[PDB]
Amino acid sequence: VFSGSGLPHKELAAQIARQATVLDSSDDFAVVFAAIGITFEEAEFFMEDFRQTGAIDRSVMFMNLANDPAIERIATPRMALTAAEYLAYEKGMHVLVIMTDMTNYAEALREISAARREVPGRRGYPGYLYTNLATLFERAGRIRGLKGSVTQIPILTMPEDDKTHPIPDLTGYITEGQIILTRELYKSGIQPPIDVLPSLSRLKDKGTGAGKTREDHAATMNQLFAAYAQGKQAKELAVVLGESALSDIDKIYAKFAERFENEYVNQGFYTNRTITETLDLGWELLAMLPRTELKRIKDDLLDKYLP
Amino acid sequence: VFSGSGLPHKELAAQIARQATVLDSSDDFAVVFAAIGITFEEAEFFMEDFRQTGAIDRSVMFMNLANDPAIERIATPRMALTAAEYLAYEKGMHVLVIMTDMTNYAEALREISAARREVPGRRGYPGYLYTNLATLFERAGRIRGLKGSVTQIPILTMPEDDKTHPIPDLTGYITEGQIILTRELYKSGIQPPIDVLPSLSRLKDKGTGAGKTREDHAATMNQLFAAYAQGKQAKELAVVLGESALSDIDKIYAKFAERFENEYVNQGFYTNRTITETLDLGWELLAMLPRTELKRIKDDLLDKYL
Amino acid sequence: VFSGSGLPHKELAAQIARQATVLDSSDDFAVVFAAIGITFEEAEFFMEDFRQTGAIDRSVMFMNLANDPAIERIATPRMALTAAEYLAYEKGMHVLVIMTDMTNYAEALREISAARREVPGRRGYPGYLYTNLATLFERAGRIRGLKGSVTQIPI
Amino acid sequence: RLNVNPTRMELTRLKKQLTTATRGHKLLKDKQDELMRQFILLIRKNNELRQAIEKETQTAMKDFVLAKSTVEEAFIDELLALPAENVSISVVEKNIMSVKVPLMNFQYDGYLHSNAELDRSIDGFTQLLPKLLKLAEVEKTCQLMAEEIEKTRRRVNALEYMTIPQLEETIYYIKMKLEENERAEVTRLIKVKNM
Amino acid sequence: TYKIGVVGDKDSVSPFRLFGFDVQHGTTKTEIRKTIDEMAKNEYGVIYITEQCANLVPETIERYKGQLTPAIILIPSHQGTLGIGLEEIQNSVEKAVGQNIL
Amino acid sequence: GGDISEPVTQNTLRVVKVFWGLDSSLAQKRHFPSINWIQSYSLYSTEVGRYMDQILQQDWSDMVTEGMRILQEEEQLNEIVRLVGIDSLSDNDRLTLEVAKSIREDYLQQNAFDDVDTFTSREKQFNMLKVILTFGKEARKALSLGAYFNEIMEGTVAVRERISRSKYIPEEELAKISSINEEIKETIQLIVS
Amino acid sequence: GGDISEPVTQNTLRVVKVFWGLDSSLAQKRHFPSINWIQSYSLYSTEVGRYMDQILQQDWSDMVTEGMRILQEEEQLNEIVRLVGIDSLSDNDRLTLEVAKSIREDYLQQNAFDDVDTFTSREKQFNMLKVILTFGKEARKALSLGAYFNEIMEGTVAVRERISRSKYIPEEELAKISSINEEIKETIQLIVSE
Amino acid sequence: GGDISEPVTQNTLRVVKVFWGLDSSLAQKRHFPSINWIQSYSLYSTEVGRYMDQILQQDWSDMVTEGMRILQEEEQLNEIVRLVGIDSLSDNDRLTLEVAKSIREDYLQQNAFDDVDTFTSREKQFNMLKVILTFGKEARKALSLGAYFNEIMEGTVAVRERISRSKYIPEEELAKISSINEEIKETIQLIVSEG
C-alpha cells in the first residue's frame, strides 16, 4: 500500500485484514504484524482493532516503535517473515504479513551505509537497497505440496508524495502491483482514497474468471478503467469551461467519474462487499454509457448482464 | 548535424558523402568518413553503400564498432583528422570529414575518465568535454597560401532530443551553426527531415554570391525562409479559426508551407540536386505567391528568373 | 531593505544615512556605514555624498570593495558592528548601522567555504549561512542599564 | 504548482507544453476578438429583427382573435389543419470562425368561407413566415456564437491565470530540484575519490 | 428536411396549423418541457414559443441554447410580450461585450 | 522513475535498432500494449515494409505510413483540442482525429489475455488496418463533395461499431472483416445522397 | 521559501497527527493567523468532534463539518469567479461566498494583539460559529421564498457587522452573541415580505 | 539558451554598471540591435543625460526620459491590448502605441551593415529623436480639439515615412531631418481646418 503522511493507510490495512476470506471455503488468516519505527498511536490503532475483532488470538506481533533504536528496524521485518514462513510452510497456516512503515526500514538501512561511509547510491541510499528489499518481499507465496501460504501486505509512505523516490520506486519493481492512496481523493472524502489508475495487481489475471470469480470480471474491469480515465479527462475540461460546450458523451463520462469515485470507490472502511455486489455495481455505472462506447466488452456479455 | 535515436542520420551521412563535391573540376575532392561506436549493421550499410556507388574511390573510411575497446573509440576521430590534415595541408586536397556518432565518442570519454577515477561532471560527462570536442572540431578550415582545405560534418544524437544536453550544447559553442533533424518531420514522411527554422549556417554568406553560386541565392533564401515561417503560421490559424477566417493571401502561404515540405526539402535520400536545380525549384515555389507579395525582391531578379 | 540589480537601493542607502536622526537631542546619534564587496564607483558615491552633506561628521565608514580578498569582505561587517557596539554601549550613543551588499557577503562566504573543502547546502551556499548571518544581525538591540542602542539596516 | 514526477523526462516535456500554451494563448485572443467583431453586427440585426417580428406577429394575432370572435367557433376549428399546405425546414451548416452556424431555408411540398377580415388575418400569418425564419436563423447564430465567445474567454482566463503560472512554477521547481540533487551526488563522489 | 413546432395558447398560435407546423398548447411547466424535449429528440428544426409559455420553463430553454438544433424562438401572444426575448439579447450581449452598443 | 534519460536506456538505444517505448499514461488507461506510437521507432520498418508488401501483394508500406502520419498529425492536433473546443475543429481535421481514434482503439489496443485477441496474423492485421484507413479515405471523399462531418458520423455508428469488434472475431472468419469494408463504401454512398 | 518538501518538514509530518500549514499569501493579505484551511489537517478532528459533542451536548461535529464544507465549496466557486466573473454566479453560489467570507473574516481571522480577540473561549467559539451558520441557513431559506441575493445583503447590513464584532464581545456578555440569532431571523423574514 | 540566470551572467551584473540584454524574440523579426529596452539599464544614464544637457544645451535628458516613458507605457498598454482587446483605444493610448512603434522602428533599429545607419552621431541622434517626439506632441495636442485617430494617420502617411527614413539621411545633410520636424506642424493643421 503506497501512501503518504496523513493518509489513512492504517484503516485500509486493518479493513482488508478484517474482511479477507477466500471463496470456495471458510478458512482463517493467521496475520503477523511488524511495526517498524511507527508511532504509538499508529501501533495502538492496530492492536485496539485486533482485540475488538478477536484477530489478536490469531496473530503474532513484532513491535518496533519510534522510541525504539533505529538499527533494530533492520532485523525486525526478517523476524516477522521468518515467523510467517514458519507458520505457513511448517505449521500449514494461511499467513498474512503486515509491515509498516517500510519507509522507516530503508532509512535505517541508509543510516548504516552512511556510517560505514560506503559508496552511496541514489539519494544517499545504498547500492544494494533493491536487493535488500528483494530479500524481504520475495519471501511470499505458495509452494508445491504444502497447504500453507504467506500473503504479504507491506506499507510505505512516499516521501514528498513522490512515486519516483528510491523507496516507492524500487519497491514497485519488486512487488506484484501496488495500492496507491492519494490526498486529492482523501480530501474529497473518498474512503478508502484509492486512485485506481496508478494502482496495480500483477496476479489478477489468473485468479479471476469462471471458477474463480464471475465470468464478466476482466471485461468490466478494463472497461471501467477506460471509462474512468476518460471520465477524469472530461471533468478536467469541466472546471476550465462549461459542461454544455463539450460533447454530451464526454458529459456522461464526466458524470460517470463522479459516480465512480463516490459510489464505487467510496464504500467506507466498514463495508464488506461480496464480489457479486461489486461487479453488479459496475454494470450500473457502465449502464450510463451507450453500448457503442463499451468497446472493451464482448457483445455476448453485453446481452447478458448490461441493463 | 543534430539528430536523435530513430532519426535517419545514417542515410543522410551516406547521402552527403556521395553527393558532396566542388563545382570547380580543378580541385581534388576527398571524403574522410569516421564511424564511432557504430553497430555492425549500419557500419556495413556505410561500407556497402560506399562501394555500390563507387564513393570509396574518392573516400577514406574509419570504421569503429560499439563492442570494440573504448580507447579505439576515442582514437578513431583523431585518426580520421590526421589523415584529413595530411590530404589537405600537405597534398592540397579539399577534404570533407564526416563523423558519427559523436555521442558514442563522448560515452567512451566518460569510460576512460572514471578509469582514472576522475569526478563528473555536467550531467555525467567530464568537465573537459568542451575542450575535448574542440581539440578535434577546431581542426578544420582553410590556411593562407595553402591549396586544399578541411571541412567537417560531425553528426551526433540528442538524448531524448533536447538541445540543452551537454553534447549538442557545447558543440554549438565550437561550431558555426547546425543542421537539425526532427522526429515530427520524419514521422510525417519528409526525407530528409531537416527542420529549416531552427537550423543555421553562420558562414553561408561567404560561400554564395556570383562566381560561387547564382546572384539570386541570398534573395531566394531569405524569401523562402520568411514565406515558410508565415506559411506554417497561417496553418495553425486555420486549425483554430477554420480556413474561412483566413485571408486569401494567408491561404496561399498555408499551401506554400505544405508544398515547401513535400517537394523542396523532401528530396529523398537517393535524390541528388545541383545548386542550380535547387535554386530554380525555389522559384517554382515562389511563383505560388501573388505578384503583389513578390515586390520584396529586386525587380532585376524577378525578371531574369521567372 | 530587499532590492535588486539596477534598482536604486544605492540612493535609498545614502538618503537614509544623511537624514537619519532622533527627536532625542542634538548629539547622541551616529551612523556606521559598512560597504561590502561593492564596486569602487558605488563606494566613492557613498564617501563623497557623506563629505558633501557633512554627514561624515557624525558617521564612521568601513569601505570594502569587490576586488578586495573574500575574507576581508566577510570581516567588514563584524568590524562595523564592533565599532557600533563600542560607540553605543561604551559611549552611550544611538548608532544606526547601514550594511550593503549582503549578497556580496554571501558570495564571499560561499567562496571561503568551498576553499575549505566544506560541503555546501541549498543552492551552493554554506549550510551555516543562517547562523553566520545571525551572528551579525542579532548584534543589534538595546541593553538594560545602558544608554544608547544599535540599529541595523542590512541592504 | 502541478503534481507530477520530478524527472528530467517530465521537465523537458513540460517546457515544450509551456511553449504550446503561450502561442495558443494569443491564438485564442485573435480568435476571440474577431469572433466578437462579427457578433456585434449579428446582434444588431437580431434586435432589429425581433422588435420588428414581435409587433407584426402581435397585430396579426390580435387581428385573428378579433376576427374569429365574429365568426362561429366551430367553423374556425375545422378550417384549421386543412392544412392544406406543408412547410418544413432545410438546415445547412455554415462556419463562422470555427462555429457551427445554421442556414435555414423554407421548403414546401383555406375554406371557401374564409371571411375577408379572417383572410386578412390568415395571410397576415403568411406575410410573417419569411421574417420569423431568419429571426430563428440570426438568433441561433448569435446564441451559438455567444457561447463560443464565453468558452473562448473562459479558456483564455484559464490559460493565463491557472495553466501557464502552474506550468512556469513547476518547470522552476523540477529544474531546481535536479540542480540540487546533482550537487548532492557530485559532493558525495568527491569524498569517495579521496578513499 | 427538418420540422417546425409551435407552442402557445389557442387564440394566438392556432393559424400556424395552416402551414403544417406541429402546434400544441401547454399550460403547465411539465407539459411544455416535455413537448420541447420530445421535439428535440424527434429532430425538430425550429420551435416558436410564446413568452407566456417560455416564462414557465426557462431551465430547459437554456439547455438547448448551446445546441445547433432545435432553435427556440420567443414569439409574443395576442396580449403582447413579457420582454424576455428582447432582454435575452441583452443577456448575451453583456456576457460577451462589456459595454453597450445595443 | 520511468525516466528514459538514464544510462541503461540511453546506452541501449545506441546499440539497438528497435525501440518499444512504454509509458505509464497509457498503462493506467489499460491501453495494452502501452507502446508510445510517437516516441517509439524501428529502423527495420523500411525493409520490413517492402518484404510484407511483396508476400501480400498489397501496398502495405503505403498503408503503414499513412496510419503513422495520421497519428503524428493527431499529436499536433490534440495540442489545440486541449485548448480550444473539439467541435471548433475543421471537418477534414475532425475526421483525422476519429480515424486516429480508430487506430488507437480498434488496432493499437490488444489484450494479451483474450484468446482471439492474444494473437493476430499478417492477413488479419492487413484486413483490420485496411478497414480503418479505407473508412477515413471514403469519408474524406464524401466530405469533399459537400457532406457534413456530423451527418456522416450518425449514419456510420452501425459500421464503426463493427470495426471496434473486428479485433474479436476468429481467424477463420477474415471474410467477416472485409465484409465491413465494402459496407462502409455502401453506407456513405446514400448518406451523400 | 516556505517549501514544505524540506526533509525536516517531511520527517516531522510522519510522526505528528496535526499539521498547521502557514501560508505566505495569507500573511501578505494580513489574514492572521495565516493558516491554510485547505492544506492543513488534524487527525484528532474525528475524536475531538465526539468529545465536544458530549461536553457541550450540542452537535458541534456537524457545525465544523458544514463550516469546512462551505470553505471547501468556496474554493471551487472562486476558481469559477476568476474565469467567468462573480456576477455569473447564481444567488446560491454568491451567498456561499458571502458566508465563507464571514467564516474567514469574522471567525478564522484572529488578531493575537487585541486584548479581547487574542483569546476566545470554547463557548464563544460555539456562539460565534452558530451565529455565522445561522445567517447562512436563514438567507438560503429566504432565497427559497423568492428573495434575491442582493436584497439580503442590503437588508442585513446592521446585523452582518454585529456578527463581525462578536469576537470583541467579552466572555461576561456571551448572551450578546446569542441574541444575534434572533435578530438574524427577524430581519431576513422581514426582507422576504419587503 | 539565453538564460541570464547563468552563474557567469549573474556574477557579472554584480560588478558591471551597464546592462545590455538581448532578447531572442527581437533577434528574429530582425530587430537589431536586439537589446531589450525594458530589462536593460544603465547606472550612468542619469549623469550622461546631464553631461549631454550641456554639450547640446538642450533638454536631452528630458527627451530620453520621455522616450523611455513612452516605451514603458507601451508595455502597460500592450497587456491592456492582450487581456481585453484593442478597444477602447481612447485615441491617446493608441497614439502612444504608434509613437512607441515609431521609436522602436525609426530609432531603436539600426543596420550595422548599412553604410550610413551603422553610425549616427549625437548631432543626428538628437534631431531624429526630436522629430519623433514632436510628432507625438503635435498629434496629442490636436487630438483634443479636435480630431479622430485615423484622420491624423491618413494625413500623416508621407511624413511618417520621412521620419522612418531619417535614419538613412547623410550626416552632411542633417538639415533635412530638421525640415521633417516642422513639416509635421503644418500637416495636422491642414486637416484640423478643415476636418
Residue numbers in the entry:
A (entry chain F): 149 to 455
B (entry chain D): 149 to 454
C (entry chain E): 149 to 303
D (entry chain G): 2 to 110, 121 to 206
E (entry chain H): 2 to 103
F (entry chain C): 394 to 586
G (entry chain B): 394 to 587
H (entry chain A): 394 to 588
Give excerpts from the publication.
Next, we soaked the eV1 crystals in a high concentration (2 mM) of ADP to verify nucleotide binding to the third ‘bindable-like' form of 2ADPV1, and obtained the crystal structure (denoted 3ADPV1) at a resolution of 3.0 Å. Three ADP:Mg2+ molecules were bound at all three nucleotide-binding sites and induced conformational changes with the crystal packing rearrangements. We thus designated the unique half-closed AHCBO'' pair of 3ADPV1 as the ‘half-closed' form. A strong electron density peak for Pi or SO42− (a Pi analog) was observed at the nucleotide-binding site with ADP:Mg2+. In contrast, the DF axis and ‘ADP-bound' forms were slightly attracted to the AHC of the ‘half-closed' form. The shifted ‘ADP-bound' form was rather more similar to the observed ‘tight' conformation. We, therefore, designated this shifted ‘ADP-bound' form of 3ADPV1 as the ‘tight-like' form. The distances between the β-phosphate of ADP and the interacting residues in the ‘tight-like' form were slightly longer than those in the ‘ADP-bound' form, suggesting that the binding affinity for ADP of the ‘tight-like' form is lower than that of the ‘ADP-bound' form. Therefore, we inferred that the structure of 3ADPV1 corresponds to the state of waiting for ADP release (that is, ADP-release dwell) in the rotation. The DF axis of 3ADPV1 was slightly bent towards the ‘tight-like' form, but did not induce any rotational changes.
V-ATPases function as proton pumps in acidic organelles and plasma membranes of eukaryotic cells. Furthermore, E. hirae V-ATPase physiologically functions as an ion pump, similar to eukaryotic V-ATPases34353637, and is composed of nine subunits with amino acid sequences that are homologous to those of the corresponding subunits of eukaryotic V-ATPases638. Thus, the V1 motor achieves its rotational dynamics via several conformational changes that are generated by the binding of ATP, release of Pi and ADP, and cooperative coupling among these conformational changes.
